[PDB]
Write a protein that binds this DNA or RNA. Structure first.
Lengths: 63, 141, 205, 45, 143, 67, 65, 100
RNA sequence: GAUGAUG
RNA sequence: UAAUUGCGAUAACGAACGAGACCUUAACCUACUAAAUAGUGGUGCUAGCAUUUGCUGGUUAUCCACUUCUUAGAGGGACUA
RNA sequence: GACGGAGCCAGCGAGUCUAACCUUGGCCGAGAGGUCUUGGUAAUCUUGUGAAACUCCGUCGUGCUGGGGAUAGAGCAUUGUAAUUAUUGCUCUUCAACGAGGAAUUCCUAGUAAGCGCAAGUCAUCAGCUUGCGUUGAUUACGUCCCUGCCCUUUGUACACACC
């Protein structure tokens, strides 16, 4: 299956009962000007590149 | 007298003293050639300050090092600091400023420890454990 | 041209004045791996000699990303108690292992190590989530730095477990592990584990 | 008699156990804490 | 150019001198070379039963050349090791005093060492000639 | 955290209200002035006092500081 | 802190009354301004000297000699 | 006339009054002397449990007594040597003078 | 917004 | 903010103990005062290899100098400038 | 990785009066140890405490095997009036469980965890313990209030021995 790439443009906060899940907003490389918010599992900064296995799943917040 | 310079380097308790003077290109550590330094795998740590700036600079000089303290690994890092420091102090006193600056730029851009010592030192033990932070095991039943 | 001194420096050790080679055999100009996401977290642009630097990387959050990758693979072989420390064995085991890769594949050995990293970092993982104590799994994305971290751990855990109670040496089992993973072969411990994590993740979206 | 636990006693309290002999103090650990300031052992680090 | 013992790696020199003395055959060997083990810390006698005594002599020869003086005690310290002690942990244990005394008495009878003021043994003018001569050969064999 | 205690806040305030014409933005100059204008018991506390006095001096250049 | 050692004296005694022993402890904080040897004030005491009045001058002048 | 005057005390302040007295006194008699050689401080440590009865968390305590030693060498006539040995007696400082 | 009795 | 640490607000105003300051120790100083019971260099005597003025040792009964490394006393340095 | 021969490097300490301490060096002995001398009341000598892990070159080769050294037999020594219920050290022989460990549970954020050994405390002899010391030196967060608790405010209470 295809895989799409996106670029973190902001880090919103932290979630999970124990803080191991940061929340980010991203900008897709191809077809930019589409942004999605989703959760990540390890340390992360601005300008990082994330490989998204499925593009269209916007992620919920525990608070 | 012939031009001379004395410098030193340290890592943990290891210390090495490098006497440097105008000569023919000798580089001996502990009264032996630099080619016989042990442990073998880390020979290129001692060779590094020479290679990085070319062997040319070392042709007109004699360098004699001596090491004490620490252990097998920490001594090697003391030697490499002394050799780099000796060359910079020699160019300070007997060549010119520019040469010292450009030399220093090469040494620093590769590895800072070649010239500035490592500030880390060991932590004391604290009663109640086998180490500075570790503790004995606790039990409740 | 070669220079001679009062102390002779062998000719095997004099060509390096033009370019730094790892273990004085392998070059760095030709190492580049195409995973666009992982460039800023694999360090192959500062050539070094001996893979024994003694740097400080545990004082700030992301300083470890600047450590050259060969040394971060060395670090992970010093494991399971009786081998903690003993970095001089790790440097020797990686000197042998890089050598075996070149013989077995006629290819740059460092570039093979890089490819093994970029084909093992799982892309999607799962997290425990619940309320009041009852829990379940939920899918999340995995960050670039952690992709490299969990890559190295898998490559060296499999190589350590494959050699234990075996006739083959550690430098060999690690050599086989790195060769297969970079090929994308399901024989590797690293690749099989990756697919187990990503299969679970898809089922818990 | 020439040796052992019976050959040594705290010079202050006649106690037999806990005696410290370093530097020829021969004072039981309890009494040492009491007399430490006068003897010249202070608490620094 | 000249050559000194310090200009050749220790591993090469020790084997070179040990061979030379084995061919030459006038070094006195104490007879118990098959029974004794080199220290109380060890559990098996040397594996190279033929040539272990010759190797020990070479090591002591170089050892004196580097430094002022030594004594049988200093060599026991240097050739000790980690005693197993079984269930209990390790501890440094000194080496065999008999063996190290009879390699120093042997080395005197060959003329490589002499007693010195301030105690212990010491290199002799003849000792320095032999070791230095063999170092230059070992370099020549670098081809 | 680099918060400064009331001993530092008030000793620094007490020097500006008496020695504005003699104080400057230089830390090294202010540091030496506080040897001749005050009696302080330690190098550490003296350095901190002179440091915060310098800090307030920059503030006054921008405008009136409260209090 | 350290000033305890400098400026505090202490003592303790046993009183064998008929009901049983009862102890006393006396603490005296000497006044540091009267110290003859050692620090003359607590560590956190800062003293600021009151400067003299200094009037503006009228016009530039010179003096000869 | 060679002499070696040594000093040992647990408190530096008194010991620098004595030493500074000796050297400044010798230079006004223009004698020849070595400098005040300061040997390494030797510290004495005693470690002990605070608790007098064995109960409670294992809390350990350490004490320290410090010893500072110094010596000077003098080559001076005996008459001046006599009064030198006599002056600079101070509580808490110990002095020994050896000839030849 | 799963479970959790007693001294 | 590590801190009842501060900025402030204010029916409260000015204070005291605790935290901080303070002390001990670990890091730096080719800058002061010195030092063979610590060091290094040179020079008398001397062993070996080569011998163009070279490489490595011995001699603490040779003597001279010096303080980079080692020791301490008195000070400098960081205050997030 | 075990074993063998070589390589070869610390820091913190302690040491002799109403007296026997720390011991270089020489010689005998497989070894422990024995004997004759010597320096140190100590930056002077023991002591560069030539320590262990460690590197190199070899022998063995996935075999409860040269991994493992418990439990036993026999002999030679040291401390002590006295060692039997072996004080401890040496030598040969005997050569068990143990194949990485269930529910549970401890410690830890860098010269730190962990591996390695040394001096000191007790001490005639006896450390597998404790207090410090150095040598080799990673992996993983740079967060959260889910479990265990802590500090401040608001709120309910039939609790005051105070949610046991």
């Amino acid at each position: 299956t295809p895989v799409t790439l996106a670029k973190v443009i902001k880090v919103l906060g932290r979630t999970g009962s124990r803080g191991g899940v940061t929340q980010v907003r991203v900008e897709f490389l191809e077809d930019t000007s589409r942004t999605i918010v989703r959760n990540v599992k390890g340390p992360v900064r601005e300008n990082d590149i994330l490989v998204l296995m499925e593009s269209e799943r916007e992620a919920r917040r525990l608070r | 007298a012939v031009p001379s310079v004395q410098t030193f380097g340290k890592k943990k308790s290891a210390t090495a003293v490098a006497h440097v003077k105008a000569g023919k290109g000798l580089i001996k550590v502990n009264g032996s050639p630099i080619t016989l330094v042990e442990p073998e795998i880390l020979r290129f740590k001692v060779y590094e300050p020479l290679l990085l700036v070319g062997l040319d600079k070392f042709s007109n000089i004699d360098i004699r090092v001596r090491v004490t303290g620490g252990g097998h690994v920490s001594q090697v890092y003391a030697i490499r600091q002394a050799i780099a420091k000796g060359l910079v102090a020699y160019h300070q006193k007997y060549v010119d400023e520019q040469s010292k600056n450009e030399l220093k730029k090469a040494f620093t851009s590769y590895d800072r420890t070649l010239l500035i010592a490592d500030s880390r030192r060991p932590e004391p033990k604290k009663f109640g454990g086998k180490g500075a932070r570790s503790r004995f095991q606790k039990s409740y039943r | 041209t070669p220079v001679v001194l009062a102390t002779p420096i062998p000719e095997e050790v004099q060509q390096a004045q033009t370019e730094i080679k790892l273990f004085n055999k392998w070059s760095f100009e030709e190492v580049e791996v195409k995973d666009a996401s992982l460039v800023d977290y694999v360090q192959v642009r500062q050539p070094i000699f001996v893979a024994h630097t003694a740097g400080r990387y545990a004082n700030k959050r992301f300083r470890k990303a600047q450590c050259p990758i060969i040394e971060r693979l060395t670090n992970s072989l010093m494991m399971n108690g009786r081998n903690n420390g003993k970095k001089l064995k790790a440097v020797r085991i990686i000197k042998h292992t890089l050598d075996i890769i070149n013989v077995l594949t006629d290819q740059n050995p460092i570039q093979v190590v890089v490819d093994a990293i970029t084909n093992t970092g799982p892309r999607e993982d799962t997290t425990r989530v619940g309320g009041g104590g009852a829990a379940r799994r939920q899918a999340v994305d995995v960050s670039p730095l952690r992709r490299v971290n969990q890559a190295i751990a898998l490559l060296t855990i499999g190589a350590r477990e494959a050699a234990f109670r075996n006739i083959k040496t550690i430098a060999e089992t690690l050599a086989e592990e790195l060769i297969n993973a970079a090929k994308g072969s399901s024989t590797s411990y690293a690749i099989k584990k990756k697919d187990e994590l990503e299969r679970v993740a898809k089922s818990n979206r | 008699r020439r040796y052992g636990k019976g050959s040594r006693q705290c010079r202050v309290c006649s106690s037999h156990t806990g005696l410290i002999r370093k530097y020829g103090l021969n004072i039981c650990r309890q009494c040492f804490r009491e007399k430490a300031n006068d003897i010249g052992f202070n608490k620094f680090r | 150019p000249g050559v000194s013992v310090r200009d050749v790696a220790a591993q090469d020199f020790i084997n070179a001198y040990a061979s030379f003395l084995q061919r030459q055959g006038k070094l006195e060997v104490p007879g118990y070379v098959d029974i004794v083990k080199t220290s109380s810390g060890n559990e098996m006698p040397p594996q190279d039963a033929e040539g272990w005594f010759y190797k020990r002599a070479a090591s002591v020869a170089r050892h004196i050349y580097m430094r002022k003086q030594v004594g049988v005690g200093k060599l026991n310290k240097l050739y000790g090791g980690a005693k197993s002690r079984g269930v209990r942990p390790y501890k440094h244990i000194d080496a065999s005093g008999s063996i190290n005394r009879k390699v120093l008495q042997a080395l005197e009878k060959i003329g490589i060492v002499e007693i010195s003021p301030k105690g212990g043994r010491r290199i002799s003018e003849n000792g320095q000639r032999d070791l230095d001569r063999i170092a230059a050969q070992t370099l020549e064999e670098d081809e | 955290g680099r918060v400064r205690t009331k001993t530092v806040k008030r000793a620094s305030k007490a020097l500006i209200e008496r020695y504005y014409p003699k104080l400057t933005l230089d830390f090294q100059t202010n540091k030496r002035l506080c040897d001749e204008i005050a009696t302080i018991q330690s190098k550490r506390l003296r350095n901190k006092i002179a440091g915060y006095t310098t800090h307030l001096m920059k503030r006054i250049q921008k405008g009136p500081v409260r209090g | 802190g350290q000033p305890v050692n400098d400026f505090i004296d202490t003592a303790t005694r046993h009183v064998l009354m008929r009901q049983g022993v009862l102890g006393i402890k006396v603490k005296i904080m000497r006044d540091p301004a009267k110290s003859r040897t050692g620090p003359k004030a607590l560590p956190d005491a800062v003293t600021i000297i009151e400067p003299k009045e200094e009037e503006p001058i009228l016009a530039p002048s010179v003096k000869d000699y | 006339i060679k002499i070696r005057i040594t000093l040992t005390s647990t408190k530096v302040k008194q010991l620098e009054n004595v030493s500074s007295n000796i050297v400044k006194n010798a230079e006004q008699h223009n004698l020849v002397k070595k400098g005040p050689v300061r040997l390494p401080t030797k510290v004495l440590k005693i470690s002990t449990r605070k608790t007098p009865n064995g109960e409670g968390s294992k809390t350990w305590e350490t004490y320290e007594m410090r010893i500072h030693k110094r010596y000077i060498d003098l080559e001076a006539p005996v008459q001046i040597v006599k009064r030198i040995t006599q002056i600079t007696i101070e509580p808490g400082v110990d002095v020994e003078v050896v000839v030849a």
